[PDB]
Amino acid sequence: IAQARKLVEQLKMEANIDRIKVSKAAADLMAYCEAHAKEDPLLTPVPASENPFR
Amino acid sequence: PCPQDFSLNFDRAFLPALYSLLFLLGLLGNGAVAAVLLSRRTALSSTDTFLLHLAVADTLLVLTLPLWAVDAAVQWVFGSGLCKVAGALFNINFYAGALLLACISFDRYLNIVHATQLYRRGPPARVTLTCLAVWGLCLLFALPDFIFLSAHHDERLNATHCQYNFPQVGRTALRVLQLVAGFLLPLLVMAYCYAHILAVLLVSRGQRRLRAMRLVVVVVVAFALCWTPYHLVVLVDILMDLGALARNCGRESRVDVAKSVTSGLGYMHCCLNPLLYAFVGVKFRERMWMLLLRL
Amino acid sequence: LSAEDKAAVERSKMIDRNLREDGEKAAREVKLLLLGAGESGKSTIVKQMKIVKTTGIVETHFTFKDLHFKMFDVGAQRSERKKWIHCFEGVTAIIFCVALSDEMNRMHESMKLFDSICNNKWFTDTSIILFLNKKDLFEEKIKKSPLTICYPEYAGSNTYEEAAAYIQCQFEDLNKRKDTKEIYTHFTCSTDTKNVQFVFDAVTDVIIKNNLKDCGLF
Amino acid sequence: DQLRQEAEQLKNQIRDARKACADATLSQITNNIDPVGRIQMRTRRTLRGHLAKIYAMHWGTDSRLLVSASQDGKLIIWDSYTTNKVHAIPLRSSWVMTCAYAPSGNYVACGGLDNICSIYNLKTREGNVRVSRELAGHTGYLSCCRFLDDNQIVTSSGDTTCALWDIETGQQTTTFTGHTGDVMSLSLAPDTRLFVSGACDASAKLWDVREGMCRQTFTGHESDINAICFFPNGNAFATGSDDATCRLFDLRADQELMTYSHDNIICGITSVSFSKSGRLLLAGYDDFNCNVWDALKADRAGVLAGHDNRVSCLGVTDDGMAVATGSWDSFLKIWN
Amino acid sequence: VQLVESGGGLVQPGGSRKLSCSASGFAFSSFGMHWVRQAPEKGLEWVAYISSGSGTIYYADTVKGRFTISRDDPKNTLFLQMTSLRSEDTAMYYCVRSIYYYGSSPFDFWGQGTTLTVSSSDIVMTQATSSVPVTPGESVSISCRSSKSLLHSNGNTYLYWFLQRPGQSPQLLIYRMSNLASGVPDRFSGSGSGTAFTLTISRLEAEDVGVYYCMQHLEYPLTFGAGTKLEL
Ligand SMILES: N=C(N)NCCC[C@H](NC(=O)[C@@H]1Cc2ccccc2CN1C(=O)CCC(=O)c1ccccc1)C(=O)NCC1CCCCC1
Ligand SMILES: CC(C)CCC[C@@H](C)[C@H]1CC[C@H]2[C@@H]3CC=C4C[C@@H](O)CC[C@]4(C)[C@H]3CC[C@]12C
Ligand SMILES: CC(C)CCC[C@@H](C)[C@H]1CC[C@H]2[C@@H]3CC=C4C[C@@H](O)CC[C@]4(C)[C@H]3CC[C@]12C
């Protein structure tokens, strides 16, 4: 009877939080990927002059 | 007096086709074996390294073959110094093949008969030492061919095939060396080692013992039957030079044609051994397929 | 090029040499994975060895005829066996212990474990040494109780020999890969030397067959 | 026995609340973004010296030194630029399944089938690496371990628990419970105030380092979750499981955002990591190679092949210059 | 950790001696070892180096041929067998450990030194200043100059700063021109470029006086240059 009460309390604490629309989170992820695109050596390779590996 | 006309015609009509076929098959098979084993050298066992050396030796021998094919075809047109290295390479490869067969047999004997004793305290570098000793011995044996081969032009039957030039005592000594080492030493070593391997495999129980027994017997009998007739003809020639010679226009002709056909059989065995040693192994087939689907 | 990087490279090369030597030393030792169902005589087999602090895995080293064996006991894990069994893919052999004196359907659980272990995708061509302990208790119980209580299909006498042979056949019939792997059976006796000698013989056979596979003779 | 009704009611309410927020979809939002190019990555370096399966690796914070753990009982510290072996540590237990490298670089950690997390001090006056600590208290194998601030470490175990330790004293500061199956991996948030643990119950949980509580639980997988990582922003994370699909969830919307799967791929996933900007997703598979996915379009952007066995560990440097992958064939490869 | 020297004394010219250096408290097998020499009232002068595992051995040009360095690792001892002793070999000999990997600090620990008395180098580094009068409330700058660019193609400038207090053995202050050694107060700092380098002390105390040396570790002759004296 302890496990059921603990589980129910956990579900309460998980349900009480506030959420955000999926479109807003998608826009935020898109904006973060866009802003830091220039600083990604794996996405846009840098010339061999400043490449530590070869 | 009957200057080997029939034997010469037989050689001209027979040698080039057989040597071309042996060249093609030997290159294909031995190069396949060398490519499979050369992709990943880190996981090479003892017998795998010995097999790689044997594949290299057979490849080089079958590469050397077409020069002697065209030598036998009409007449040797190349440089008089070119076959002084062609024949040396040929002899090196012949002795290397024989000694590496013996070494494969000895390694298999060690892995199976002395399995526990070699597992517990087996040396970690004896394979390379054995291979280098074999190659050094082959160079030592090939030195006589390296410094006594030349190309002299006899007035009769104007042409120039290149061969040896030393007293007949030297010819007998070279023939005895060739016979004793190349045939008897691998034959005795393989016989002893594989007899002990068979004695060990008799008492064991399982399904992976009958295939091993079959492969052992197949390898031994194949080598024996492929390389006995040529040395029989060599013995006949040695006896003939030391008396008991008829030369009734047919004896030398028959001896020469027999020597040619048995040499062809020997090179057939040289081209045939990667089938015996590599493509029957489950591990080798697995690695070959792994390479094939990787590329 | 390299000013004091040559000393770094030399240190790296000495590290490589020591690593190679340690690997060579470790490659001349035998690996056994000890498995059982609910501590069914595993300790007694372990006691034959002569040579809360830890609860994950137990090591047991011994030497027989100059050969060094290391046995790994993983009986105190109680977690998903499928999440760490692949760590033991390269062990030389498995040693499966089964108590013959079985009471609540324990032989069925032992067979389920044996089926899950022998037919595992990681333990192909890995040999299993099956120990059947408690032969005297089996004698007494089979004198008292019949084997039909565990096997309704059994249609033999209550003799020790027939019952033991039937149990051994029932265990060995769970091996699907009858060709690429072999099962060695031994009814454990009180003598200490006999168990170690049987393990040594089985390991010698396993080494021989592995060498045949590596030599190309199969 | 009457509380299951309330649990079902709360679960249904949570599901409906998650349903109400799904006003759009990431794919139909980002379809207008031009796709990233076909990616070729070249193997700059190959590190040799491990004689058994490599089970874990971790990068240094300088993005030059890395540590690798292999079940030959070895920890090796490599200088990736020159492929030099800085240190070689022999472990008491050969059964190592994880390793970590401290953010300061002073210590390393390892663990495995011995249920003990061993912490080694690299910078000693005696010139040798010696065991600094052995944290014990887990009743199952260690699956992962991550250093927080050079004095406390978070570990996950196969006894369905996680624990935050105190290296100075050796005592479990906090114990995180609530998973049903073994916890296979954890990922540390960039601010080190939260972390996510993925378990074998096909669930992921977001634990708060303080208060020792689970804040959110994410489902959607169909098999054991083997790998987990955070988005660089720290507001989303990605998981890989045994059903051959990666998933991308977000913390704020409290539900799945995207799935990465292909009809050809059927084997499980061992490692998952992002890129520096978060546009790429590196995933290691059991079919002997690695896949680079577009994190915003769910289309495979590249393949990293060249490992002869299962790719078990995978990491991306802090500066994002290179990707190091290690497999069961006992080799690590640097890609760029 | 300590290095203890033995074998000094008075020797006639042309004789032979063997200096011993016993090491306790550290893994002697992992450290390369150097013998350094300091003539009476003169600067430091590198003499010999033996690698770890006795792989590579280097000698100074002025002592090559008549000196021999060796190590015995089971007993943790370092020997310098010197022969044909001239009158210019009277000095104090120091035994120095140095371990090399990525991010290490060679030359960190120096022995006490043994005195040996005898009766009757393409990179030169100049410390032009010889003495400086200071008070324990200011900041002091010591300049060192090289004849070659100490900066290497891998971004590492190989300059080391050592401090020798009166009556003691030199201790590592800075390695590779920027990094402070372990157990060194933060007030010390180092900088420079290629050929001109500077050591800076923010606020001195009574224990900041002594002789400062700038060694190079680019080419192996390992020249030192006469130090700069700070007193009062
Ligand atoms: N007088 C000449 N030129 N040769 C006549 C017959 C020589 C005969 N060869 C052969 O029978 C056949 C066929 C043949 C026929 C006529 C001419 C040449 C050949 C070439 N052959 C070979 O099989 C190649 C022989 C060879 O490669 C070689 C090596 C060293 C010195 C000389 C030749 C031979 O002695 N072979 C050498 C043997 C070397 C070891 C065993 C295998 C053969
Ligand atoms: C291991 C050692 C023997 C290396 C072998 C390579 C040397 C010795 C070989 C390879 C090429 C050979 C030469 C090739 C061509 C000729 C021209 C000929 O009219 C006389 C012999 C002569 C001059 C050969 C002598 C031996 C030779 C120089
Ligand atoms: C003209 C004469 C002197 C040339 C004959 C010598 C040549 C053919 C021989 C001598 C030494 C031999 C090599 C010795 C060792 C190895 C390593 C092995 O893993 C592959 C074969 C290989 C690479 C051999 C190839 C053939 C070889 C190069």
Numbering used by the authors:
A (entry chain G): 9 to 62
B (entry chain R): 42 to 336
C (entry chain A): 5 to 55, 179 to 229, 239 to 354
D (entry chain B): 5 to 340
E (entry chain S): 2 to 121, 136 to 247
Manuscript text:
PS372424 is a peptidomimetic agonist of CXCR3, consisting of a cyclohexanemethylamine group, a natural amino acid Arg, an unnatural amino acid Tic and a deamino-Asp(Ph) group. The benzene ring of deamino-Asp(Ph) forms a π–π interaction with the side chain of Trp1092.60, and the carbonyl group in the side chain of deamino-Asp(Ph) points against the benzene ring of Phe1313.32. The binding patterns of CXCL11 and PS372424 are also very similar, with all TMs of CXCR3 having the potential to be aligned well, and only a subtle conformational difference in the ECL2 loop could be observed.
CXCR3 belongs to the class A G-protein-coupled receptor (GPCR) family. Following activation, CXCR3 couples to Gi heterotrimer or β-arrestin to initiate intracellular signals of T cells that express the receptor, causing T cell activation and migration toward the inflamed tissue. Here we determined the structures of human CXCR3–DNGi complexes activated by chemokine CXCL11, peptidomimetic agonist PS372424 and biaryl-type agonist VUF11222, and the structure of inactive CXCR3 bound to noncompetitive antagonist SCH546738.
